[PDB]
Design a protein around this ligand. Structure first.
Ligand SMILES: [Zn+2]
Ligand SMILES: [Zn+2]
Lengths: 97, 267, 48, 49, 178, 294, 111, 213
RNA sequence: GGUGUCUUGGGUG
C-alpha cells in the first residue's frame, strides 16, 4: 500500500512506519473481522481487481478480433496444405504432423 | 524490457571467476560511472602549475592553451570494476589523439586525478568536458547497461546415458546487442538468444525469427500453467513469417496483402 | 464564391469528416450523415 | 499456532527494518536497496500467511 | 465557500509581514502564508499564528469550513476558504501539553446529556457541539497534518487473550503517541 | 413533470501549483501548471505552464520557458521577469534564491540567464513577447508594446490581481513557482499527486447553475444590444418590457436541466452530458444514493 | 558559486588578462573588472549530499505526526526524540535514519 | 594486446569465409579448413605484427558434386580489401580484375563502409556477380547457431519438381528476402528455392521451402 | 393491410 498521504498510508499512522500493519497486512481472518484500516486496504485491493476486470476485456476483445481477421481465410485443403485466400502456402502440412 | 541470455563456453560455464571476468568484459562503463566531480582550472604555464599537488607529477612527466581540466576519479569505483588509471588514460588518448594533452596522477596517489590541456577558450573546455564524460567508453559492448550472473539448471545425459541435472553459470543482460555480444570471446557464439525477435531477424534470419516468436508466445501463454496445443501457435507464427519479413497483426500488416478489397474494407 | 460553395456541398455530400474545416451541419446542430459515415464504423454498412 | 506464526513474521519484518535502517541489507542483482527490502518483506509476509 | 476578508484581517493583525517588506537576505527561516493559493505574506513564528487561528475557528469566529493547513518541511502555512472542498467531522483530542486534561477527548458526558435534552442549561444541537470546540471539520489537505485515533479506546494503550475478538493493533513502533 | 437531480461535478482545484514529470521521447521533462480563477464568480480565467526544456543528458540547453496565454511561442523566464520590471539578474536570482548557501539550484539557473542575456530593459523584452501574440500582421512597435503589456498585466496570474502597479507580487509568485519546479527537478521533492483528493473540488447545483446562468445572461445582454441598436435608430422612447425576450433564459435552463447537456443548445456537442439525470425512484435507498452521487 | 556586479548588479563572467595572466571577472554590461580570489571557474557534482540533515527546522519538535523514539540524546541525555529517514527522494538512497532531540534541538544519528 | 584481438577476429572471419565458400559448393583443401590462429598469424602477420590482407584472397573452384547438381556454378573470387573506407576507385579495380580473369562470383569483404557511388557498380557488371560483406558481420558463423536450421538450395529441375508436386506458382510459396543473413550467406538469387529441414516437436522432422524474393 | 430516426444518463450478462 503506497504512501498516499505524506509519508504514510492512512492518517492514523505515524510518518515513515514500514511495519506490516501500516502498509497493508491484514492480520485477521474473515471470521474474526477486519479492522477499519484493514477494511480500507482490502477495499483498495478489491477495487484494483474490479478496475482490471472492467478495463482489460476491451483490449482482449480487440486482440481476438485482430487475430480472427488475420487468420480468417486459412483452411486445410484436400492436398493437406494450409493456404490463405490468395492460395499462398502457410504450411505444407497442417501442424507439421 | 530487452534482454539477452548469453550461454558461456563450458570451461567458463563451470568456473565462477572466469564467468565474472566475462561479465566484466561484456558490461558497458563510461567515464560517468567512475567520476566524482569535475573542475576547470586556469593553468597559465604548461611547464609549471598554479597547483601544489601535481607539480611533481608533471616534472616527472617532462624530464598550448592555459586552460586546464582537473577531473577526479573515486577509488572504490575503480576497484569494483577492475579499472585502473592507465586504461582510462589510454582510452582517452585513443579518441583524443592530438586535440588534447593529458596529465594524469598515478594510481597509488593519495588523490586520483586527471589533467587535460587545450591546444577566449572558456567554453571549448566545457564542451570537451561534457563530451568526455558522456561519450568516452572504456570496455564492453555499447547497449548492454547491466549484466547478471544467473544460474541455469540444464538437464544433460551422463556418461551412462541417464539424464542428470547440471548447475551452470550463464548471463542475462539489460539492453540488447546480439551481433557484438555474440562475437565477444568466452561466449558460446552458437547459443546466444535475444527476447527481441526483430533483432533475431536482423541478425540470424527468418527461420530463427520463427523459432524465437514461437518461444515468446509459448512463454507468455504457458506462464500461468495454461496449455495451448502446439499447432495453433505454430500456425500463428507461420502466418507472421511467411513473406520473409515480420508481418504484424494490425491494419498496417493485414491490409498490405494482395487479397480482395472487400476483405480489407470489412476489417 | 459560388463555385466553391458547390465544391463544398459536393464534398460534404460524400465525406463530412474532412480535416481542418467546419462540418456541414443540419438545422438541429447535428452534423450531416455523409455516405462515408454511412459506410464506416461498428454501426456502418459493412460491420453493422 | 496461527497467532504465534504471525508474531514471528512481525518480528522478522522488524529485524529486516532494523537491518535496512542501519545499512546492513544484502542487495539483489538488478534491484535497488529499497526494492530488495520490499521484496524480502513481501516474501516474509506471504510465507507467514 | 466563505469570504477571505476576515482571514486576511486576522493575519495582518497577528503579525504577518507583507511581500512588499520581503528581503530573502534576512528571511531565510520565515514561513510564507498562502490564502486560497495566493501568497500574501510571511511570518516569523507560525506556531502561535496557527494556534490562534485554530482557536478562532473552534470558537466560531471563523467559518467552521475553513482549512488551516500548516506544512513544516516546506515552511508554509496554507489557509483555504474555497468553495467545493469535501470535509468530514472528527472529535478533538485535547492536545495542549500543559494540563491533566491532556491526551483525552474534550467531549464529555455533560455534552451528551445536553444533546439528549435538546437545550443548554443556561436549542443545543450539532452546531453547538461544533462551535464549542469538541468537533471540527477537516478536508483532505488538512488531514495530512493530523494524527487520528481510530476508536476512543485507542486513546489509551491497554495492558485480553480473547480467542474470538479481533486483536486491536499493538501500535508498538512509536514510543508515545500524540 | 419529471424529477431531475444535479450530479456533483469533480474538478481539479484552482490556484494551486502542481509539478509533473514527462515522458522519455519528450524534450520537456518537468512542467509546473497553475490554473487561475477569482474568488468572485469562481470561473476559470487563464492557464500558464512553466516547462523545463532539456532531457537527462540530452537537449544541451536546460533552459526553462513559460507559456503565457495569448502568445504562440514560449518566452524564457528572465525575459518575463524583465518585462514585469526586474532587469538585473541578481534581483531575479534573489527573487528565486531565499538561501544563498544552496548551490545546485544556482548551478541549474545559468543556461536560462545565458539564453536570455540579450535583453537589458523592459520595452525590448516586452516587444519580444508582443511579436508572438498571435494577432494580425504588421502592428507597429509602440502598440505591440501595449498589447504585450496588457498580457503581462491581465491574463498573467489573474487570481493574484489584474491591476497595474503590483508587478512585484507576480514576480514573487513566479519565483515561488520556479522554486517548486527546481525542487521537483532536483529530486529533492516528489512530484505532485494528481489523484490527491485534497486538490479537488465538487461542483453542486450552485456553481453549475451559476455557470449556465452566466452564459445565458450574456446571451440575453447581446440580444438587448442587438435590439437597442435597431430601435434607438427610430429615435423613440421604449419601455424595455418589449425589449427583453424572456424566453431565452427560460428555454436555456429548461433545455439544460431536461437534457443534461450543460451548455447552449446549439453547442450540444463539446458540452458535458449527464449533468442532470432522472431521479431514481425505484426504491428509497436508490433515491438517497442518487441524491449524493459524484 | 558565481557572484554579481557591485555596480550594474548583473553577474561577472570569467576572462583572462593576457598581459598579466591572471583570471579577472568581466561585467558583460558595465566596464568594471575586479581581481578574484578563487581560481576555480567551473564545478560539477554527481555524488552530492546537500539535503541530508537539511530537512530539519527549529520547530520540527512541534510536529505531532513525527514518530518518537527512545534513543539517548548524546547532548543532554534526553530520553525522548522524534526521528525520520532521509528527506532525499532518489531511488538508490539509503533507508538510514536521522534523529532530532526535542530538548536541545541538536540533530544526532545512530552510528 | 589489442593486436592479438584484431588478428584473432580477422582469423575468425577468415574461417567463416572459408566455411561459407565450402558450404556454397566450392572445393576447399582440408588443410586450409583447419587453419589455426598461430599458423594464420605466421602466414599473414609481419615483424611489426600488422597483417597482409592480400594473401588471404583465394580462388575457389566448383566441387564436382556441386557441378553435377548446380550446373550454373562457376568460379569464386574472395577479396579482403585494404582501404578501410572503400570508394569508386577500389570497386572499379575489383570489377576490372573480376571481368579481366572471368571470375563468375566476387565476394568483397570490407572493414568500415562502402560508399553509395561504389555500391552502384555492383549490378552493372554483368554477367559476373559481386557481393560484399562487412568483417564485423562475418565474425560469427550464424549457420552454426542452434536456431538456424540447415538450408539447401534446390536445383532448377528440383524446383520444377517441387512446383509440379504441389501444383504451385512461384508467388504462392513462402518467401525469403534477398537481404536475409542466411540468404546473403548462401548467395541466393531471385527465383531460387531453398529447402529447410528443421526440428518439429509434433512430428520429429519437417521440411519447409522458401523462394528467394 | 401497412406500429419512424439520433444522442445523454442509470443497470443486467
Ligand atoms: Zn556590472
Ligand atoms: Zn538533546
Amino acid at each position: 500500500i503506497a504512501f498516499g498521504f505524506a509519508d504514510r498510508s492512512l492518517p492514523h499512522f505515524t510518518k515513515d512506519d514500514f511495519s506490516p500493519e501500516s502498509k497493508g497486512f491484514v492480520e485477521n481472518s474473515y471470521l474474526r473481522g477486519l479492522t477499519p484500516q484493514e477494511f480500507f486496504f482490502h477495499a483498495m485491493a478489491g477495487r484494483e481487481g474490479l478496475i482490471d476486470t472492467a478495463v482489460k476485456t476491451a483490449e482482449t476483445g480487440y486482440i481476438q478480433r485482430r487475430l480472427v481477421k488475420a487468420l480468417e481465410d486459412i483452411m486445410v485443403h484436400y492436398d493437406g496444405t494450409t493456404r490463405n485466400s490468395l492460395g499462398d502456402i502457410i504450411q505444407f502440412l497442417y501442424g507439421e504432423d | 524490457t530487452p534482454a539477452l541470455t548469453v550461454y558461456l563456453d563450458r570451461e567458463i560455464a563451470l568456473d565462477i571467476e572466469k564467468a565474472k571476468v566475462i561479465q566484466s568484459s561484456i558490461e558497458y562503463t563510461t567515464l560517468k560511472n567512475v567520476t566524482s566531480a569535475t573542475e576547470i582550472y586556469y593553468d597559465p604555464d604548461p611547464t609549471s602549475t598554479v597547483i601544489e599537488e601535481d607539480f611533481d607529477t608533471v616534472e616527472a612527466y617532462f624530464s598550448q592553451s592555459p586552460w586546464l581540466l582537473r577531473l577526479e576519479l573515486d577509488r572504490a569505483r575503480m576497484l569494483d570494476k577492475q579499472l585502473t588509471m592507465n586504461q582510462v588514460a589510454d582510452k582517452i588518448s585513443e579518441v583524443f589523439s592530438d586535440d588534447l594533452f593529458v596529465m594524469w596522477s598515478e594510481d597509488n596517489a593519495d588523490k586520483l586525478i586527471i589533467r587535460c590541456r587545450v591546444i577566449e577558450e572558456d567554453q571549448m573546455l566545457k564542451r570537451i568536458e561534457a563530451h568526455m564524460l558522456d561519450l568516452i567508453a572504456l570496455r564492453g559492448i555499447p547497449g548492454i547497461s547491466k549484466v547478471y550472473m544467473v544460474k541455469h539448471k540444464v538437464s544433460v545425459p551422463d556418461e551412462s546415458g541417464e539424464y542428470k541435472n547440471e548447475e551452470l553459470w550463464a548471463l542475462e543482460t539489460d539492453g540488447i546487442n546480439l551481433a557484438e555480444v555474440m562475437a565477444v570471446p568466452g561466449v558460446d557464439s552458437s547459443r546466444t538468444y535475444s527476447n527481441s525477435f526483430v533483432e533475431i531477424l536482423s541478425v540470424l534470419g527468418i527461420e530463427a525469427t520463427r523459432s524465437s516468436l514461437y518461444k515468446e508466445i509459448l512463454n507468455v501463454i504457458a506462464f500461468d500453467g495454461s496449455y495451448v496445443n502446439y499447432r495453433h501457435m505454430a500456425l500463428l507464427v507461420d502466418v507472421m513469417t511467411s513473406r520473409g519479413y515480420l508481418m504484424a497483426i494490425t491494419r498496417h500488416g493485414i491490409n498490405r496483402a494482395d487479397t480482395g478489397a472487400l476483405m480489407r474494407c470489412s476489417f | 464564391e459560388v463555385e466553391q460553395l458547390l465544391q463544398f456541398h459536393v464534398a460534404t455530400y460524400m465525406d463530412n469528416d474532412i480535416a481542418g474545416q467546419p462540418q456541414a451541419l443540419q438545422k438541429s446542430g447535428r452534423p450531416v450523415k455523409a455516405i462515408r459515415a454511412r459506410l464506416k464504423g461498428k454501426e456502418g454498412r459493412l460491420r453493422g | 499456532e496461527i497467532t504465534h506464526a504471525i508474531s514471528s513474521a512481525k518480528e522478522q519484518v522488524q529485524e529486516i527494518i532494523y537491518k535496512a535502517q542501519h545499512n546492513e541489507l544484502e542487495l539483489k542483482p538488478g534491484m535497488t536497496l529499497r526494492e530488495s527490502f520490499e521484496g524480502e518483506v513481501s516474501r516474509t509476509l506471504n510465507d507467514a500467511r | 465557500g466563505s469570504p477571505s476578508e476576515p482571514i486576511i484581517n486576522f493575519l495582518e493583525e497577528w503579525g504577518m509581514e507583507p511581500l512588499e517588506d520581503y528581503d530573502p537576505a534576512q528571511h531565510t527561516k520565515s514561513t510564507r502564508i498562502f490564502v486560497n493559493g495566493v501568497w500574501t505574506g510571511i511570518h516569523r513564528d507560525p506556531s502561535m499564528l496557527v494556534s490562534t487561528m485554530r482557536d478562532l475557528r473552534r470558537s466560531g469566529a471563523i467559518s467552521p469550513e475553513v482549512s488551516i493547513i500548516r506544512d513544516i518541511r516546506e515552511r508554509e502555512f496554507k489557509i483555504f476558504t474555497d468553495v467545493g472542498r469535501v470535509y468530514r467531522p472528527l472529535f478533538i483530542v485535547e492536545d495542549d501539553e500543559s494540563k491533566d486534561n491532556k491526551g483525552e477527548l474534550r467531549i464529555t458526558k455533560e455534552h451528551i446529556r445536553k444533546i439528549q435534552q435538546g437545550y443548554d442549561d443556561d436549542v443545543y444541537g450539532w452546531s453547538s457541539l461544533v462551535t464549542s470546540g469538541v468537533i471540527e471539520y477537516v478536508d483532505g489537505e488538512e488531514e495530512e497534518t493530523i494524527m487520528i485515533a481510530m476508536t476512543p479506546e485507542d486513546l489509551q494503550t491497554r495492558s485480553l487473550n480473547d480467542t474470538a475478538k479481533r486483536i486491536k493493533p499493538e501500535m508498538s513502533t512509536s514510543s508515545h503517541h500524540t | 413533470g419529471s424529477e431531475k437531480v444535479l450530479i456533483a461535478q469533480e474538478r481539479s482545484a484552482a490556484n494551486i501549483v502542481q509539478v509533473f514529470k514527462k515522458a522519455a521521447p519528450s524534450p520537456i521533462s518537468h512542467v509546473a501548471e497553475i490554473r487561475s480563477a477569482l474568488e468572485k464568480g469562481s470561473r476559470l480565467i487563464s492557464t500558464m505552464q512553466i516547462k523545463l526544456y532539456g532531457r537527462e543528458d540530452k537537449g544541451t540547453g536546460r533552459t526553462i520557458k513559460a507559456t503565457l496565454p495569448y502568445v504562440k511561442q514560449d518566452i524564457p523566464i528572465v525575459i518575463v521577469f524583465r518585462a514585469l520590471g526586474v532587469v538585473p539578474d541578481g534581483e531575479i536570482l534573489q527573487h528565486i534564491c531565499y538561501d544563498e548557501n544552496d548551490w545546485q539550484m544556482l548551478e541549474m539557473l545559468k543556461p536560462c540567464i545565458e539564453e536570455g542575456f540579450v535583453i537589458q530593459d523592459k520595452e525590448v523584452a516586452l516587444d519580444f513577447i508582443g511579436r508572438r501574440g498571435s494577432a494580425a500582421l504588421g502592428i507597429r512597435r509602440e502598440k505591440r508594446i501595449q498589447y504585450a503589456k496588457d498580457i503581462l498585466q491581465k491574463e498573467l496570474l489573474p487570481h493574484i490581481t489584474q491591476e497595474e502597479g503590483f508587478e512585484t507580487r507576480k514576480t514573487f509568485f513566479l519565483g515561488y513557482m520556479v522554486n517548486r519546479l527546481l525542487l521537483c527537478a532536483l529530486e529533492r521533492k516528489d512530484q505532485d499527486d494528481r489523484d490527491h483528493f485534497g486538490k479537488k473540488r465538487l461542483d453542486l447545483a450552485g456553481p453549475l447553475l451559476a455557470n449556465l446562468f452566466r452564459i445565458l445572461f450574456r446571451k440575453l445582454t447581446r440580444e438587448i444590444y442587438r435590439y437597442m441598436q435597431r430601435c434607438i435608430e427610430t429615435d423613440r422612447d421604449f419601455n424595455l418590457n418589449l425589449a427583453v425576450k424572456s424566453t431565452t433564459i427560460t428555454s436555456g435552463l429548461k433545455y439544460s436541466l431536461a437534457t443534461g447537456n450543460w451548455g447552449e443548445q446549439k453547442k450540444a456537442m463539446s458540452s458535458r452530458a449527464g449533468v442532470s439525470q432522472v431521479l431514481n425512484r425505484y426504491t428509497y435507498s436508490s433515491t438517497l444514493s442518487h441524491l449524493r452521487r459524484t | 558559486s558565481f557572484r554579481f556586479c557591485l555596480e550594474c548588479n548583473n553577474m561577472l563572467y570569467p576572462k583572462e588578462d593576457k598581459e598579466n595572466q591572471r583570471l579577472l571577472y568581466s561585467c558583460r554590461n558595465c566596464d568594471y573588472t575586479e581581481l578574484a580570489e578563487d581560481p576555480k571557474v567551473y564545478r560539477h557534482e554527481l555524488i552530492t549530499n546537500i539535503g541530508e540533515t537539511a530537512g530539519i527546522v527549529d520547530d520540527i519538535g512541534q510536529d505531532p505526526t513525527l514518530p518518537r523514539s527512545d534513543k539517548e540524546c548524546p547532548e543532554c541525555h534526553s530520553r525522548d526524540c522524534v526521528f525520520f529517514q532521509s528527506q532525499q527522494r532518489r531511488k538508490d538512497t539509503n533507508m538510514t535514519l536521522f534523529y532530532v532531540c526535542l530538548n536541545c534541538k541538536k540533530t544526532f544519528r545512530d552510528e | 594486446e589489442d593486436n592479438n584481438r584484431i588478428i584473432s577476429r580477422l582469423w575468425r572471419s577468415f574461417r567463416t569465409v572459408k566455411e561459407m565458400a565450402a558450404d556454397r559448393g566450392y572445393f576447399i583443401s582440408q588443410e586450409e579448413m583447419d587453419q589455426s590462429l598461430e599458423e594464420f598469424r605466421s602466414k599473414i602477420c609481419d615483424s611489426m605484427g600488422n597483417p597482409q590482407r592480400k594473401l588471404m584472397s583465394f580462388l575457389a573452384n566448383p566441387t564436382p558434386e556441386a557441378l553435377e547438381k548446380y550446373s550454373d556454378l562457376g568460379t569464386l573470387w574472395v577479396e579482403f580489401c585494404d582501404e578501410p573506407s572503400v570508394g569508386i576507385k577500389t570497386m572499379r579495380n575489383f570489377c576490372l580484375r573480376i571481368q579481366e580473369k572471368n571470375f563468375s562470383t566476387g565476394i568483397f569483404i570490407y572493414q568500415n563502409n562502402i560508399t553509395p557511388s561504389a555500391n552502384k557498380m555492383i549490378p552493372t557488371v554483368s554477367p559476373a556477380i559481386i557481393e560484399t560483406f562487412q568483417e564485423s558481420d562475418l565474425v560469427v558463423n550464424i549457420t552454426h547457431h542452434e536456431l538456424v536450421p540447415k538450408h539447401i538450395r534446390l536445383s532448377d529441375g528440383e524446383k520444377s519438381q517441387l512446383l509440379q508436386r504441389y501444383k504451385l506458382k512461384e508467388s504462392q510459396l513462402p518467401r525469403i528476402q534477398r537481404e536475409d543473413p542466411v540468404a546473403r550467406y548462401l548467395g541466393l538469387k531471385r527465383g531460387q528455392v531453398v529447402k529447410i529441414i528443421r526440428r518439429s516437436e509434433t512430428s520429429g522432422r519437417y521440411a519447409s521451402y522458401r523462394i528467394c524474393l
